[PDB]
Ligand binder design. Structure first.
Ligand SMILES: *P(=O)(O)OC[C@H]1O[C@@H](n2cnc3c(N)ncnc32)[C@H](O)[C@@H]1OP(=O)(O)OC[C@H]1O[C@@H](n2cnc3c(N)ncnc32)[C@H](O)[C@@H]1OP(=O)(O)OC[C@H]1O[C@@H](n2cnc3c(N)ncnc32)[C@H](O)[C@@H]1O
Ligand SMILES: *P(=O)(O)OC[C@H]1O[C@@H](n2cnc3c(N)ncnc32)[C@H](O)[C@@H]1OP(=O)(O)OC[C@H]1O[C@@H](n2cnc3c(N)ncnc32)[C@H](O)[C@@H]1OP(=O)(O)OC[C@H]1O[C@@H](n2cnc3c(N)ncnc32)[C@H](O)[C@@H]1O
Lengths: 119, 132, 132, 133
C-alpha cells in the first residue's frame, strides 16, 4: 500500500506543478506530510487547493509544503527525517547543504532567544 | 429529526457569526481576535456538516464512512449531492488543521479565501438537506 | 537598550560606507572590488537589523524565529513595525542569504536597485526602533 | 569529485585569487577600507564553501549532523577525513568571519593581514584533502 500510495502522490504532484525539482515525504510515514521544491514559489491558495486534492485522493489529511517559502527550521526537519520520492540527486544535495548551513547560522542567531525561553 | 435541525441551525448560526466578525475584511488581517473567532466558527461548520453527512449515511444505510471525507463521498456516490459540491466540502475537512496550529501568516490568506468563496458551499449543503 | 545604541551606529556607519563606495555608479558594474565592499556592508546592515530584532524579541518574549525573515514578522505581528516595512526588510534577508549562502547566482542588477531605492528602509528601521 | 564539491572548490580557488589580487602587498591595504571590505567578503566566501563541503560529506556518509558550523569540521576530524590541526585552523577561521561580519568584538586588522599571508594555505590544504577522497 505504501508503494502504491507513494506513486499516486508522484503522479498528482508532477501533473499539477511545473518545473518540479524535488518531492519529499517527511513527518510520520492517517496523516500525510508532503514537501516539494520547484523553480518558482507556489501560490498560497493554489498550493492549499492541491493539498486538498491530494487529501481527497488518498483519503487522508495532507499538508503540502513549499520548500521555496518554508521556514529554515521546517527545511531542516525535512532534510533530517525525510524520504526523497522524486528528483535528481544533485538537486537533493544542493538543497541539503543549503538548508543545513542556513540552519547552522540561524542556530547562532537565535540561541539567545532559545535560552531565555528554556530558563 | 431534532439532531438534524439543530446541526442545520448551528451551521446557519456560525455563518452569521463568521460574516459579522469578518465584516468587510479591512481589520480582519490585523486583529488576531477577529481571526480567532472566524477560524473557530469555521471549524464548527465543518464538524456540523460531517455530523449531518454521517447521519444520512447511517439513516439510509449508504455505507460506513472510514474517514470524514469518505462520508461526503458516500452521499455523492448515491447521487444525493453533486460531485463538485462534495469536493468543496471535502476541501473543508482539511480546514480543521488551521485552528489547532497557530501558524498565523501562512494560512491567513487561506481563511480569507474560504470566507470569500466557500461559505456558500455550506449554504448549498443545508439547502439539499432541507429539500429531502 | 544598550546594545541597540551600538548596532544603530553600525547600520549608520555601514550605510555611509555603502554610499561612499558606490558614488555615482559609473564604475560599479565594472569594478569587482567596489561591488565586494557594497555587498559586504549591505550584509552587515542585514545582520545588524536581525540582532536588534532578536534582542527585542528576547526583551519582550514575542516568540521563537523559525527563519531570519521570521524575526521581522514577529515585530510586525505585534504591530511594532509596519507590515510593509517587515516585508521590505524580509526582502533584504533574501538578498543577504544569496550573498552568504551560494544557492543562487547573485544578481547585480538587484544590488544596484537596492542601493538606490531600498537603503531608506534601514534608515526607516533605525528611526522606528529609536522611538520605542 | 561530486558535482557540489567541484563547484565549491572552484568557488574557493576563485576567491583565493581575489584575496591575493586585492591584497597586492599591503601598501594601501591598512589605509583603504574598501580593500579591507573586499578581502573580508572573499574570506567569507571561502569559509562558507568549506562549511558547505564539510556539511555535505557529513551527510553523504552518515557521520552525524553538526549543530554548529564548527562541529562540521570537528566531525570531519573525528572520522579522520581532515587532520586535527587543519580542523582547528578552519574553525578559527569562522571566528574571524563572524567578528568581521557582525562585530561583537573590535576587528583586529593585523589578524586579517596575517591570515592572507600565512593562512590561505589552509583552504588550499582543505580542497586538496577533499580532492583525494
Ligand atoms: P533564501 O532562502 O533566503 O531565499 C531567497 C530567494 O531564493 C528563493 N529560494 C528559496 N529556496 C531556494 C532554493 N532551494 N533554490 C533556489 N532558490 C530558492 C526564494 O523563493 C527567494 O526568492 P524571492 O524572490 O522570494 O526573494 C525575495 C528577495 O530575495 C532577494 N533575491 C532573490 N533572488 C535574488 C538573486 N538572484 N540575487 C540577489 N538577490 C535576490 C531580493 O532581495 C528579493 O527582493 P525583491 O526582488 O522582491 O525586492 C527587491 C527589489 O529589487 C528589484 N528587482 C527584483 N528583481 C530584479 C531583477 N531581476 N533586476 C532588477 N531589479 C530587480 C525590484 O524592484 C524589487 O522590488
Ligand atoms: P564567534 O564566537 O563566532 O567567533 C569569535 C571567537 O571568539 C571567541 N570568543 C567568544 N566570546 C568571546 C569574548 N567574550 N571575548 C573574546 N573572545 C571570545 C570564540 O570562542 C570564537 O572562536 P575562537 O576564539 O576560536 O576564534 C579565534 C579566531 O578569531 C579571530 N579573532 C579573534 N579576536 C579577533 C579580533 N579582535 N579581531 C579580528 N579577529 C579576531 C582570529 O581569527 C582568531 O584566530 P587565532 O587568534 O586563534 O589565530 C589566527 C592567526 O592570527 C595570528 N594572530 C593572532 N593575534 C595576532 C595579532 N595581534 N597580530 C597579528 N597576528 C595575530 C595567530 O598567530 C594565528 O596565526
Amino acid at each position: 500500500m505504501q508503494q502504491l500510495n507513494e506513486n499516486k502522490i508522484i503522479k498528482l504532484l508532477r501533473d499539477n506543478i511545473p518545473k518540479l525539482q524535488l518531492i519529499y515525504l517527511f513527518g510520520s510515514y492517517s496523516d500525510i506530510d508532503i514537501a516539494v521544491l520547484a523553480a518558482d514559489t507556489l501560490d498560497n491558495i493554489a498550493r492549499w487547493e492541491l493539498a486538498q486534492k491530494l487529501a481527497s485522493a488518498l483519503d487522508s489529511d495532507v499538508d503540502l509544503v513549499d520548500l521555496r517559502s518554508a521556514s529554515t527550521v521546517l527545511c531542516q526537519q525535512v532534510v533530517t527525517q525525510g524520504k526523497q520520492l522524486w528528483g535528481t540527486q544533485q538537486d537533493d544535495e544542493l538543497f541539503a547543504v543549503k538548508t543545513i548551513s542556513m540552519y547552522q547560522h540561524l542556530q547562532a542567531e537565535r540561541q539567545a532567544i532559545i535560552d531565555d525561553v528554556m530558563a | 429529526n431534532d439532531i438534524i435541525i439543530n446541526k442545520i441551525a448551528t451551521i446557519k448560526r456560525c455563518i452569521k457569526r463568521i460574516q459579522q466578525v469578518y465584516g468587510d475584511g479591512s481589520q480582519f488581517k490585523q486583529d488576531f481576535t477577529l481571526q480567532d473567532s472566524v477560524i473557530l466558527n469555521l471549524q464548527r461548520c465543518c464538524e456540523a456538516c460531517i455530523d449531518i453527512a454521517n447521519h444520512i449515511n447511517r439513516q439510509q444505510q449508504l455505507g460506513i464512512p472510514q474517514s470524514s471525507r469518505d462520508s461526503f463521498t458516500l452521499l455523492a456516490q448515491n447521487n444525493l449531492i453533486t460531485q463538485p459540491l462534495s469536493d468543496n466540502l471535502k476541501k473543508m475537512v482539511g480546514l480543521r488543521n488551521i485552528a489547532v496550529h497557530d501558524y498565523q501568516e501562512l494560512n491567513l490568506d487561506i481563511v480569507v479565501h474560504v470566507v470569500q468563496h466557500h461559505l456558500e458551499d455550506f449554504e448549498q449543503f443545508i439547502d439539499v438537506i432541507k429539500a429531502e
